Structure 1
């Protein structure tokens, strides 16, 4: 597991080189944006249950075949597993947001997951839809202008959107 800082270190060491002025300045900016990052993480985590539930309800409304008899999310066991996966993915996405690097998400969550779903008969394209919805709500919650010092978090929202699309791409 790497964060944004260790990633530079690991790249510098492979070269056997000290950090450059460009790298030092690149990492100082990350620090200077740290407050916004923590807000995003605090905001998405404080509404994790709503993001999951509301995304689940929307998915089943658009794809009612997943919950009809014979569907992959039919029976409470499968429904619970499905909601669980959604929590798991959102959990490791917030891990990536805090670290500033996707490695934790790739290694501990998206690695081999596409194969897991194919062996079980779970439609990965439907999982991606579930992920895209958590994303929209997560960004909407994270970038809410209310009750927070005004400022520009657009670069941060683009990064967060990337981790979600990465998970969606990995399962489809």
Structure 2
């Protein structure tokens, strides 16, 4: 896996190029905005059980067929596997936000997930709805605008961090669509 810094190094090595002052402004800004990124990750991990519970329950209340017989969340075994998948996806999205790079998500989570869901009969459309609800929750927590819980932060702009996490959630739906 790569992080924001080794991503720059991989791009430079492709041109046999040293990383110099020209190339470092984004990375110096990444460092200067580092406390905000640690806060963003804390806001998600601190609410992760409620996010998954609420996102999967949401997917179901909107499409109650999922819990009918022959539905894919019918039985405790299936529902537990689905909640497990919501937590795994959220885990790898949180790694991507900590690292400032999607590689851990793409390589260890999304690689071969479409093929797995196809084989298993896991509805990729319902999955994407669960992920879209977790995107909505994640942006609310990073920006301290969740309706049912606020956390403690020095006031500042986290727009970029909210945009980035939204982009990671969007890759999941891109990979399994």
TM range (shorter): over 0.9
**Residue 29 of structure 1: aligned partner:** 29
Q: Over aligned residue pairs, what C-alpha RMSD do you find? A: 1.0
1:114-151: CA deviation from partner (whole Å, max 9, x where unpaired): 11111111110110000000110111111106521111
- 2: distance between equivalents of 1:11 and 1:31? 19
Q: Contact between 2:142 and 2:161, CA under 8 Å: does it hold in 1?
A: no
Matching residue within 158, 170, 174 for 1:165: 170
Give unpaired runs (5+ residues) of structure 1. none
SS in 1 for 2:74: coil
- 2: distance between equivalents of 1:28 and 1:63? 46
Give unpaired runs (5+ residues) of structure 2. none
Q: Output the TM-score relative to the length of structure 2.
A: 0.94
1:154 and 2:165 aligned: no
1:2-36: CA deviation from partner (whole Å, max 9, x where unpaired): 00001111221222211132212221010001011
User: Alignment length, in residue pairs?
Assistant: 172
Q: Contact between 2:95 and 2:105, CA under 8 Å: does it hold in 1?
A: yes
- 1: distance between equivalents of 2:6 and 2:112? 25
1:54 and 2:54 aligned: yes
Deviates more, 1:79-88 or 1:136-145: 136-145
